[PDB]
């Protein structure tokens, strides 16, 4: 299990002087989502290419890449266009095996959202997969938060830090939700956190979101 975030280690939105729209968009309406596809190509050792039009999926390692080539898979996640290379669009992880992983209805996972330690609200996200990627769930989660709680706005964010914690049975892991300090967000660097292709079992996952205000 990933241990919790140390003090300071969480990124701060007031130490980001670039444009929060650079992050908001990764969790806006547009995203990649394809059902029952197989890879037609491979740029580097750690990636696979799909036509969905061209999407290059990059894993953290070869074993993953090799694992899902020549497999029919579902593909879901957040993509980017800038500093993206096939030598068309790029993403990390977000792959799951299609056959044997499908539910005929949607599971609901409750997301619990806290602010300065208080209970802010709860809402559900939906998934028709037995096993689903944390990336998918994160994006369903943040998306709702962007439409409804102004989590990311064009210029800045009303929250100071924020992380998203996933607990299944008794293991847990977390993502920082704020861009690293400086005057310019890099989408490709941020999104790399999802290249381990982490999977959770939908029947069992709990999700909690922890935001502070400034």
């Amino acid at each position: 299990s990933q241990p919790d975030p140390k003090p300071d280690e969480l990124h701060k939105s007031s130490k980001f002087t670039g444009l929060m729209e650079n992050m908001k968009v990764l969790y806006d309406d547009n995203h990649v989502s394809a059902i029952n596809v197989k890879s037609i190509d491979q740029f580097l050792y750690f990636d696979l290419i799909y036509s969905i039009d061209n999407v290059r999926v990059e894993f953290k390692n070869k074993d993953l890449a090799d694992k899902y080539k020549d497999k029919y898979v579902d593909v879901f996640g957040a993509n980017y266009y800038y500093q993206c290379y096939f030598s068309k669009t790029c993403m990390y992880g977000g792959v799951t095996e299609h056959n044997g992983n499908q539910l005929d209805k949607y599971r609901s996972i409750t997301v619990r959202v806290f602010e300065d330690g208080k209970n802010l609200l709860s809402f559900d996200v939906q998934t028709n997969k037995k096993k689903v990627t944390a990336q998918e769930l994160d994006y369903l989660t943040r998306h709702y938060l962007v439409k409804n709680k102004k989590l990311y706005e064009f210029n800045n964010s009303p929250y100071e830090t924020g992380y998203i914690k996933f607990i299944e049975n008794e293991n847990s892991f977390w993502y920082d939700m704020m861009p690293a300090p400086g005057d310019k967000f890099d989408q490709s660097k941020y999104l790399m956190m999802y290249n381990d292709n982490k999977m959770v079992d939908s029947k069992d996952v709990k999700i909690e979101v922890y935001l502070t205000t400034k």
Epitope: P3, D4, F114, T212
Partner: antibody, heavy 120, light 108 residues
């Protein structure tokens, strides 16, 4: 493992002051809702004070202005300073921690507590 | 404040029976209601969070239901080791409040 070891319980006079402590270990200290809950001699539990991972403090009307919860982030010590104590403040005072993270209303780990008696 | 009221004050159960404890709140609190068990000479222990979401390590004979103002803790096949006092808590909004406890007693 998650340890919570309260100390500082004592007998005090009506109107006096006491400092309670909670040496914690086995978890990242700054990442958790930490609270004090007390047990009255009639066996009521009452929420007394909470501190969020991020330093926000909360109190019930009946202790505000008299009680202060705080953290020593170097030493992992959770403190409850209590001023102007009343007979009604007599109880077992428990240190508590959230189950998963920054949420101050779910008591998943409890210390063995520490007796406070306010009496002449 | 939100007043939690537990029912009944005392239960007297035979080991093996399926038993039920009730908690009514004065306003709706969604499912931000948690359940605790306290045994003699011991600290309280969290049994159930969010009305029904269970907790790693708790025997699965404890379960909860309800939402809004009415909640229920079920103890399936009670064991003699279950004697003690059981509390519900408003974790929804301030001030967080606790119900006044329900004492469980065993028959022999």
């Amino acid at each position: 493992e998650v340890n919570l070891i309260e100390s500082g319980g004592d007998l005090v006079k009506p109107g006096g002051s006491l400092k309670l402590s909670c040496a914690t270990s086995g978890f990242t200290f700054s990442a958790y809702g930490l609270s004090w809950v007390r047990q009255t001699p009639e066996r009521r539990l009452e929420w007394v004070a909470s501190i969020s991972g991020g330093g926000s403090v909360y109190y019930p009307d009946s202790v505000k202005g008299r009680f202060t919860i705080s953290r020593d982030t170097a030493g992992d010590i959770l403190f409850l300073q209590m001023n102007s104590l009343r007979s009604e403040d007599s109880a077992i005072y428990y240190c508590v921690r959230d189950l998963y993270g920054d949420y101050v209303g779910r008591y998943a780990y409890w210390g063995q507590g520490t007796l406070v008696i306010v009496s002449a | 404040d939100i007043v939690m009221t537990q029912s009944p004050a005392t239960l007297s159960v035979t080991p093996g029976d399926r038993v039920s404890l009730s908690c009514r709140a004065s306003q709706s609190i969604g499912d931000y209601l948690h359940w605790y068990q306290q045994k003699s000479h011991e600290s309280p222990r969290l049994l159930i969070n969010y009305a029904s979401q269970s907790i790693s390590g708790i025997p699965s004979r404890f379960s909860g239901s309800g939402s809004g103002s009415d909640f229920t803790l079920i103890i399936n096949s009670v064991e003699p080791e279950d004697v003690g006092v059981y509390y519900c808590q408003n974790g929804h909004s301030f001030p967080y409040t606790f119900g006044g406890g329900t004492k469980l007693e065993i028959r022999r």
